[PDB]
Design an enzyme around this catalytic site. Structure first.
Site, PDB file in Angstrom:
ATOM      1  N   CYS D 148       0.847  -1.174   0.000  1.00  0.00           N
ATOM      2  CA  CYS D 148       0.000   0.000   0.000  1.00  0.00           C
ATOM      3  C   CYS D 148       0.890   1.233   0.000  1.00  0.00           C
ATOM      4  O   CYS D 148       0.716   2.129  -0.825  1.00  0.00           O
ATOM      5  CB  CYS D 148      -0.908  -0.002   1.235  1.00  0.00           C
ATOM      6  SG  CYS D 148      -0.110  -0.528   2.813  1.00  0.00           S
ATOM      7  N   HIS D 175       0.962   5.610   9.676  1.00  0.00           N
ATOM      8  CA  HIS D 175       0.088   4.539   9.259  1.00  0.00           C
ATOM      9  C   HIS D 175      -1.049   4.158  10.202  1.00  0.00           C
ATOM     10  O   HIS D 175      -0.903   4.210  11.419  1.00  0.00           O
ATOM     11  CB  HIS D 175       1.009   3.339   9.007  1.00  0.00           C
ATOM     12  CG  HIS D 175       0.462   2.335   8.050  1.00  0.00           C
ATOM     13  ND1 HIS D 175      -0.656   1.579   8.324  1.00  0.00           N
ATOM     14  CD2 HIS D 175       0.877   1.964   6.817  1.00  0.00           C
ATOM     15  CE1 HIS D 175      -0.910   0.788   7.299  1.00  0.00           C
ATOM     16  NE2 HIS D 175       0.007   1.001   6.370  1.00  0.00           N
TER      17      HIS D 175
HETATM   18  N1  SND Z   1      -4.211  -2.746   4.187  1.00  0.00           N
HETATM   19  C1  SND Z   1      -2.886  -2.646   4.013  1.00  0.00           C
HETATM   20  S1  SND Z   1      -2.192  -1.852   4.658  1.00  0.00           S
HETATM   21  C2  SND Z   1      -2.207  -3.570   2.976  1.00  0.00           C
HETATM   22  C3  SND Z   1      -1.935  -3.053   1.697  1.00  0.00           C
HETATM   23  C4  SND Z   1      -1.311  -3.836   0.708  1.00  0.00           C
HETATM   24  C5  SND Z   1      -0.944  -5.159   0.979  1.00  0.00           C
HETATM   25  N2  SND Z   1      -1.211  -5.697   2.260  1.00  0.00           N
HETATM   26  C6  SND Z   1      -0.788  -7.108   2.486  1.00  0.00           C
HETATM   27  O1  SND Z   1      -1.770  -7.997   1.880  1.00  0.00           O
HETATM   28  C7  SND Z   1      -1.760  -9.255   2.611  1.00  0.00           C
HETATM   29  C8  SND Z   1      -3.179  -9.668   3.042  1.00  0.00           C
HETATM   30  O2  SND Z   1      -3.652  -8.641   3.894  1.00  0.00           O
HETATM   31  P1  SND Z   1      -5.008  -8.709   4.747  1.00  0.00           P
HETATM   32  O3  SND Z   1      -6.115  -8.551   3.770  1.00  0.00           O
HETATM   33  O4  SND Z   1      -4.890  -7.694   5.841  1.00  0.00           O
HETATM   34  O5  SND Z   1      -5.079 -10.184   5.337  1.00  0.00           O
HETATM   35  P2  SND Z   1      -5.919 -10.859   6.522  1.00  0.00           P
HETATM   36  O6  SND Z   1      -5.018 -11.494   7.510  1.00  0.00           O
HETATM   37  O7  SND Z   1      -6.881  -9.878   7.061  1.00  0.00           O
HETATM   38  O8  SND Z   1      -6.636 -12.013   5.694  1.00  0.00           O
HETATM   39  C9  SND Z   1      -5.865 -13.061   5.122  1.00  0.00           C
HETATM   40  C10 SND Z   1      -6.797 -14.187   4.897  1.00  0.00           C
HETATM   41  O9  SND Z   1      -6.022 -15.256   4.328  1.00  0.00           O
HETATM   42  C11 SND Z   1      -6.661 -16.480   4.759  1.00  0.00           C
HETATM   43  N3  SND Z   1      -5.682 -17.621   4.636  1.00  0.00           N
HETATM   44  C12 SND Z   1      -4.657 -17.890   5.493  1.00  0.00           C
HETATM   45  N4  SND Z   1      -3.960 -18.969   5.124  1.00  0.00           N
HETATM   46  C13 SND Z   1      -4.567 -19.364   4.034  1.00  0.00           C
HETATM   47  C14 SND Z   1      -4.185 -20.474   3.271  1.00  0.00           C
HETATM   48  N5  SND Z   1      -3.148 -21.207   3.662  1.00  0.00           N
HETATM   49  N6  SND Z   1      -4.920 -20.765   2.143  1.00  0.00           N
HETATM   50  C15 SND Z   1      -5.967 -19.977   1.799  1.00  0.00           C
HETATM   51  N7  SND Z   1      -6.330 -18.898   2.548  1.00  0.00           N
HETATM   52  C16 SND Z   1      -5.641 -18.551   3.671  1.00  0.00           C
HETATM   53  C17 SND Z   1      -7.085 -16.189   6.224  1.00  0.00           C
HETATM   54  O10 SND Z   1      -8.126 -17.044   6.771  1.00  0.00           O
HETATM   55  C18 SND Z   1      -7.436 -14.696   6.187  1.00  0.00           C
HETATM   56  O11 SND Z   1      -8.877 -14.442   6.252  1.00  0.00           O
HETATM   57  C19 SND Z   1      -0.740  -9.057   3.771  1.00  0.00           C
HETATM   58  O12 SND Z   1       0.558  -9.639   3.474  1.00  0.00           O
HETATM   59  C20 SND Z   1      -0.654  -7.548   3.938  1.00  0.00           C
HETATM   60  O13 SND Z   1       0.512  -7.066   4.605  1.00  0.00           O
HETATM   61  C21 SND Z   1      -1.844  -4.905   3.269  1.00  0.00           C
END
Ligand code: SND
Ligand code: SND
Ligand code: SND
Ligand code: SND
Lengths: 333, 333, 333, 333
Positions: D148, D175
């Site tokens: 992000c 942040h």
């Molecule tokens: N919002 C900000 S700041 C942002 C911006 C850009 C990227 N990210 C990154 O994007 C990624 C996802 O972020 P998030 O949406 O906050 O994730 P969040 O942890 O809220 O959701 C991840 C989902 O993945 C699911 N999951 C876990 N393991 C598995 C698996 N083995 N197979 C299938 N599904 C699975 C899990 O149940 C969960 O609901 C992270 O690495 C963040 O750091 C965050």
């Protein structure tokens, strides 16, 4: 005192701080998930109860606090903890995992003599200092100190009941944010509301405190029930209790009863105040429950809403030590 | 509609936003503490309800919203505002300073036909859409729309009383912060708790809402009362009503009475839900009161605790326009 | 010490608490807007720095704290305050209204001997303990203790500058919520962003701290400037300073310089830490500025970002007393 | 489009919402920690971005959103997901656990053509819409969309570098809280500060964003670096870039380069504003980076501090769909 702690969590660390205050003796701690130098850090710095004033350091695989040496174990299984090795006899069980008599007994394997569950228990007898310590017997090997909220409600319910008789009552605890909550909308399969962003919402939730009071004060069993609201505050909660009384009375009789109790038999347990207080005024408060005189309202001679504050884990922690003290007194008599 | 607004605050501004959607017509605004170019800003950007999607701009000493030309005045005292000049007949008194029939009558000088106090009044007849609008008669010059909380409670109380009869009830409203609170500990001579930092505390507070319900629903007069808890949330509050009913009933019966009411007589005013909702799920909601089925609890067949949500800013605004539309249909009839 | 305080506000009350700690003597207080019994309440309860441990009471029109009698005046005009009658000689001016030498001199009309402005001043000489007290002369009748943020930056800038020479630097202070902010979107004609809901937003803002450092450390005048961000935290701010140095160096030389300074000449003023600290770990901290070793980053031998914490009004309050002590020492020599 | 998503979290869920608006096509989702009826809930209700307006319901073990039928899988390991079954060719890897080219290649077994890591990758080529998409070639099977923060910084850095040349810069990002933080002090062995209560603290943190910009814009490699401060806000963050330029320029020149870029080459990606905005004014914003003209400050002709906003959740999601649309136009060309 020869106290031992299993689980160096929020309760476990607060119990340790409290012990040092009240002069109790903790000789060993067990936590398989927290490294030794990390224990120093989590014990020293606390966002809510502040910086620990005193020396804290790792020294020869042990934790040294103000010169007192505390042995540290990292056993995943209770049966494997060398309690006797460290000289620990009274075990404060605060992992939140071994809360039943059966599970908790694994501690006797290691040499422990008594186990105090710092949480509600499905079968271990429950105690609330000031309400039912009369029920404690020296041959009870495993006991429970109920929950933070039960320790707030019980004292107040006891005073109300013994004076005007509680016919029935509904309770709401406006509660501070907890560790089982989430910073942002996330998965919580066991509680959908509980997974919604904690800083953004008022979250309807549950509490077993009302039912639990039925076990601590048998006559009230089945006459109370309640719910909770999780709000965006860091610490300190408040009990909003609405009761129907059996004896007619004025709100003044109620304030009088609470004030008398706080100065006498429930001193140190039930506090009393007529000041214009707010939740922050109770951070670090020792009492289990503080009656807010001005906040309550009475609709009729038998229908009233009473309010009582309590600092979540802090007052509870003081009560854990208090319970262990009463126990050792009765146990060595 | 020919609506005029006095006090471009949280309500004043949202009543305008709501008017632009329900198709109502605002032709004049009046606020001394807000300059013309500053109104463009406070109306366009809103921390809680989002950035306004549409054109807002100053033009000819006038405010122009999506074509609509809105005459602006900056008077400091009511009787001054030249309402007649702009063509403003119905005035929304939302400053919170001229709530009595006397003070609010000032607007009559300017040539205003009717006045609607967007707050409780000490003597102006109070109305709650869906509860007592039939009592409104054209000969009434100054009326009140009660408070945000009375608008949430009344609907729920009407339903419970009409179906099972309310014997007595006590209400607690876990309320979001308001404009009258302080960000950090500051002076508030009339409400000491009220001056405490709003972002760190749960602040006990008063409310007249429960008694006001006694004025909107005459039969409940004196059988209801309550209090409030101000919590660190920007918007959306919840009513926690503990009531003692006159007829034995199950909780299913209560859910059914609620769902039914929300589909007929109180549709659009009282909502019904069975989802695991939280406060943020009601930001921008039009209803005055949304019954949360899952949150309620029942102790006995005549003692139950009911929970209902409400977007204290938005829903009330919608009701303000609704009240004006009812008044005009009766006034011009 | 014979200290007098004008304006029993956030700073005024913290200065009183601090005085009691450091053993300073406050003999009189003046505030025309706060009633006597309300002063007791605002002094006793503090949402951030907690409950005042000690006795506080009104007694014969005076305020009694821990047995010490404090005369209370309610004069709207400085010239009318009987400072001499109460025996007050050193006046802490903390109303935020009489900050210039001309305005501040009205205190001499009541018998005061010296006036310390607890805020920046357009013309009163400014001092930052540990940075430029050498310049203070006994014949200066009115002085300023600068601002909370200047007291944080000055020490750090001094150490950096005297060792590697600051060529130029830009500063950002991530600041806690202030009293001039609003709980919800409201009018703030002098600062549109500052009127937006404080609990919901990150609010870009201003600070004169960088410019002020140019007056406390002349060589840096015109080489520093900066801004602020208001965030939703109740207390404690942090200075994010990005500087271009004249001498090449390693981040280790910088940590070394800061550590040396904190143990020596700036002890009690500039703290040093290598722990994994967060804002709450500094509530109630005496130092004006605490260097966070781990938080800083260096891009090149002459381009680095340094971070320093400071508890807003609390460290500042300790500095006010410190300044008065230095003054009286020099004044009676 | 034939898009599939692995990880129905904050991003996974918002990518679906964004897809439904930009008209993209999602045909399959996969998340083991979320049951089918629970997905309906987590997608419908959102604390930050509002309640979804449209029909969402379960039907035939499938998720149906406004008619769209979306196949649901619950596998715990990547290579298992039968993407081919659903017809999912382009996979959005948003679990944050399979970020490397290796781990992400698992989806290939299921029959997936391409994979887009919705997070930084240690070895998959990183892209930033508007900055380096011209470097994407069809032969690439696994790509990253950076973070992000990198998406907010890169646009701004490109403009500053292309016009005045960036010599060196240091970045600070204030942040909003993330899913990996804790509501109250809890264990976080890999990031001690990270485990501290997120609702009470300003938490220093790390970020790779500034260095990642060195990978997206090769020339800036090694000339940029920074850090972060986690604050108590639910969504929307801001970049504070202190940069030293190679060509003397005025701040007006910088504003002009920005406004220009936002109307041509970077329109829809980089926004420009001169209003007195705050973080909440960007909730739901589509752009990757919104330059705040008023907030910036300039020390000298070659030393300036730039400020740019970004809705860390929403804007990034929009960019994810955008990246897929570019890939498909090139892949099918
Ligand atoms: N919002 C900000 S700041 C942002 C911006 C850009 C990227 N990210 C990154 O994007 C990624 C996802 O972020 P998030 O949406 O906050 O994730 P969040 O942890 O809220 O959701 C991840 C989902 O993945 C699911 N999951 C876990 N393991 C598995 C698996 N083995 N197979 C299938 N599904 C699975 C899990 O149940 C969960 O609901 C992270 O690495 C963040 O750091 C965050
Ligand atoms: N909420 C209530 O709060 C109480 C728990 O509070 P809390 O302790 O602060 O929660 P918290 O989660 O902070 O404490 C858990 C602690 O127990 C530790 N732990 C986990 N498993 C084990 C194990 N097998 N052996 C030893 N230690 C272990 C864990 O590492 C941590 O330090 C319960 O009574 C709940 O009902
Ligand atoms: N916002 C919620 S939740 C709510 C719900 C129901 C009722 N109310 C009532 O509505 C009233 C206003 O509430 P608010 O919108 O929160 O207030 P807020 O302070 O946000 O706005 C009041 C406005 O009144 C303006 N004003 C003040 N004095 C004058 C004057 N003398 N002449 C003309 N304009 C003036 C002032 O500039 C300000 O913008 C109060 O009586 C509330 O109790 C508020
Ligand atoms: N702003 C700066 O912030 C500082 C004050 O901060 P703060 O204490 O938090 O502000 P705050 O507003 O809380 O304190 C001001 C105090 O001064 C009092 N006051 C106002 N006018 C007079 C007067 N004419 N005579 C005596 N007392 C008066 C007022 O009642 C209050 O207690 C000052 O140094 C300002 O320059």
């Amino acid at each position: 005192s020869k106290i031992g702690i299993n689980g160096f969590g929020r309760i476990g660390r607060l119990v340790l701080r409290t012990a040092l205050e009240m002069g109790a003796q903790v000789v060993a701690v067990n936590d398989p998930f927290i490294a030794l130098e990390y224990m120093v850090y989590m014990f020293k710095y606390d966002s809510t109860h502040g910086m620990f004033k005193g020396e804290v350091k790792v020294e020869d695989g042990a934790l040294v606090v103000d010169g007192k040496k505390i042995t540290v174990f990292n056993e995943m299984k209770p049966e494997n903890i060398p309690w006797s090795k460290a000289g620990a006899e009274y075990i404060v069980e605060s992992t939140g995992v071994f809360t039943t008599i059966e599970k908790a007994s694994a501690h006797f394997k290691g040499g422990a003599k008594k186990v105090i569950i710092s949480a509600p228990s499905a079968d271990a007898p429950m105690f609330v200092c000031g309400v039912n310590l009369e029920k404690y017997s020296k041959d009870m090997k495993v006991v429970s100190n109920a929950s933070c909220t039960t320790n707030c409600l019980a004292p107040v319910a006891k005073v109300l009941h013994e004076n005007f008789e509680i016919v029935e009552g509904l309770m709401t605890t406006v509660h501070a944010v907890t560790a089982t909550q989430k910073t942002v909308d996330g998965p919580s399969a066991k509680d959908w509301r509980g997974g919604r962003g904690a800083a953004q919402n008022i979250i309807p939730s549950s509490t077993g405190a009302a039912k639990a009071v039925g076990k601590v004060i048998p006559e009230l069993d089945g006459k109370l029930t309640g719910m909770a609201f999780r709000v965006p505050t860091p610490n300190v909660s408040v009990v909003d209790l609405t009761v129907r009384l059996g004896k007619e009375c004025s709100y003044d009789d109620i304030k009088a009863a609470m004030k008398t109790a706080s100065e006498g038999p429930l001193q140190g347990v039930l506090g009393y105040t007529e000041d214009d207080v707010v939740s922050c005024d109770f951070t670090g408060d020792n009492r289990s429950s503080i009656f807010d005189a001005k906040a309550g309202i009475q609709l009729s001679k038998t229908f009233v809403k009473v309010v009582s504050w309590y600092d979540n884990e802090f007052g509870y922690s003081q009560r854990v030590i208090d319970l262990i003290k009463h126990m050792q007194k009765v146990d060595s008599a």
